[PDB]
Amino acid sequence: ASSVNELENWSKWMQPIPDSIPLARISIPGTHDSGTFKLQNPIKQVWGMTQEYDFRYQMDHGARIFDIRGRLTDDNTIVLHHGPLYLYVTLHEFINEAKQFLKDNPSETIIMSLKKEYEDMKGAEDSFSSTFEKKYFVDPIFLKTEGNIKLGDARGKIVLLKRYSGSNEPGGYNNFYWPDNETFTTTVNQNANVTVQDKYKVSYDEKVKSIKDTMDETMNNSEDLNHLYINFTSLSSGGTAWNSPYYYASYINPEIANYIKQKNPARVGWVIQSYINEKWSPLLYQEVIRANKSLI
């Protein structure tokens, strides 16, 4: 909690950050459609795959925010989906990976975004929200405290970012507006504000400008601890060819990695990327973590 060299430890990078820092102010790497790593079917993967490695690999690479999309099944369980595609991964499977990681690295915390991706199965007993809260959320690893959550209250726990309607259990970040395919601003709570850049399905040129534009706003608003900045660098279009999330990401990641590197900002916000790996040159996630040196 003193050396900047400690941010270079991908599994324990949150250790140096002061306990009093709200998670909002922290620059955190995230993964888009985190549970698509099992899609190995050639045609399914050219449209649905946004990750090639599992949850643990992702976390061991500094990722601390996970984009979870679920669906209520007959068996009254929540499984992971990408549209109408069952990903061969379950919500329990994710929560268990998160627990092991937090057991080994108690200094860390993981933010889980939960969204209803597909319509509930016909024979379901309860609704998506009630099912998730009665069977999962009730688990102790879930932080039940709200407001502008500090890193201290989050260590060893899973912080929930609600992207589902109809919640009845307090805890984490409340659900807000979130319009389709665009960048917007709203409020989470009385003591918080949100700016999200979620322009999936858009031109590469418009996409890159969007990311950078949102990243400039957070750079110049670095000391505003009451403002949440979520920046999705992922881009999806017509697959089958080099228009896949992998193709765009092979350019977008190093590009934004450099952008962050050159500017040397004190805050870049929460950056949710596709294909977290070690292939691309400057490494986006690593640069994002480094921008936290100002907090050390």
Swiss-Prot record:
GO cellular component: extracellular region
Domain PI-PLC X-box residues, every copy: 22-163
Keyword Transmembrane helix recorded: no
Any single GO BP term: lipid catabolic process
PROSITE patterns membership: PIPLC_X_DOMAIN (PS50007)
GO molecular function annotations of the record: phosphatidylinositol diacylglycerol-lyase activity; phosphoric diester hydrolase activity
Compartment(s): Secreted
Chief location category: secreted
Functional summary from the UniProt entry: Cleaves glycosylphosphatidylinositol (GPI) and phosphatidylinositol (PI) anchors but not PI phosphates.
Protein name, as recorded: 1-phosphatidylinositol phosphodiesterase
Organism: Bacillus cereus
